[PDB]
Amino acid sequence: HMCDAFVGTWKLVSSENFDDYMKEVGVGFATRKVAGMAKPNMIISVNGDVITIKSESTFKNTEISFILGQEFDEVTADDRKVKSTITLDGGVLVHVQKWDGKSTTIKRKREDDKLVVECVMKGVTSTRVYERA
């Protein structure tokens, strides 16, 4: 019943500072431009201990399935090959991606009727707000 409040289909409604976040991650110009235009959905489901997060957009369709606390391989939408671990901390899903001696953290939290996604790469934070589809 862990992540019940996350389950569902969500649509992007606002973004702030995402180009700067992508620059800090190392995303190149053309991918920043096209991927920054995208308006993904996020489809979150749970089956037993396995959480699945799918993100569909005109740019790319991605999907991850995982167990909390258990590292996995992920290919990001910008084609990074990262080692990811996702945990639940005080009701927030905390997703750490490691690659090339670098690290970024993505937090997903329910706030009112929204699902708020905060992405942090060193000093740079981007906030993306999703609402139910």
Ligand X SMILES: Nc1ncc2c(n1)N=C(c1ccccc1)c1ccccc1C2
| Residue ranges at the known binding site for a fatty acid | 128-130
Q: Which residues are annotated as a binding site?
A: 128-130
Stretch that binds ligand X, among 3-11, 52-60, 66-74, 81-89 (CB under 6 A): 52-60
Contact call for residue 56 and ligand X (CB under 6 A)? yes
Contact call for residue 82 and ligand X (CB under 6 A)? no
Stretch that binds ligand X, among 3-11, 43-51, 59-67, 86-94 (CB under 6 A): 59-67
Contact call for residue 125 and ligand X (CB under 6 A)? no
Contact call for residue 51 and ligand X (CB under 6 A)? no
What is the SS3 assignment for the chain?
CCCHHHCEEEEEEEEECHHHHHHHHCCCHHHHHHHHHCCCEEEEEEECCEEEEEEECCCCEEEEEECCCCCEEEECCCCCEEEEEEEEECCEEEEEEEECCEEEEEEEEEECCEEEEEEEECCEEEEEEEEEC
